Amino acid sequence: MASAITALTPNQVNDELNKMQAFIRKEAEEKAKEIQLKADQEYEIEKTNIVRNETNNIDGNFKSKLKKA
């Protein structure tokens, strides 16, 4: 694998990438989950809120108009 030299691949780079990658992995995953759960939660709650308010509004208007009529 053109790695016969074994001189351009010390241990410093190995460990460095190990921790570095690990840190970026957890940070990236955690951040993605936070933004994913936050956006999804806000999207579901917001959507339901609008749908609920709209349904109640139209239902109340038609119900009130019909009853009053």
Side-chain angles (χ1 to χ4, degrees):
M1 283 262 250
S3 274
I5 302 124
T6 315
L8 47 137
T9 58
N11 259 315
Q12 188 224 99
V13 58
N14 222 62
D15 300 307
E16 179 115 290
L17 277 162
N18 231 48
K19 291 81 167 50
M20 181 129 138
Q21 172 172 318
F23 270 49
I24 298 295
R25 168 131 200 187
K26 220 185 242 273
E27 213 173 49
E29 269 242 320
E30 203 252 62
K31 175 128 206 248
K33 185 101 173 73
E34 239 258 305
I35 302 296
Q36 186 89 76
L37 83 89
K38 275 238 287 218
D40 279 323
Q41 279 247 266
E42 264 217 313
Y43 267 45
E44 182 70 40
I45 301 157
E46 282 282 2
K47 179 166 169 92
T48 307
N49 168 231
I50 302 162
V51 179
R52 268 196 133 168
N53 190 90
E54 181 227 304
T55 302
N56 165 80
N57 199 110
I58 302 299
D59 167 284
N61 238 84
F62 280 57
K63 173 163 96 122
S64 71
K65 273 189 136 156
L66 270 165
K67 274 192 91 230
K68 185 163 256 276

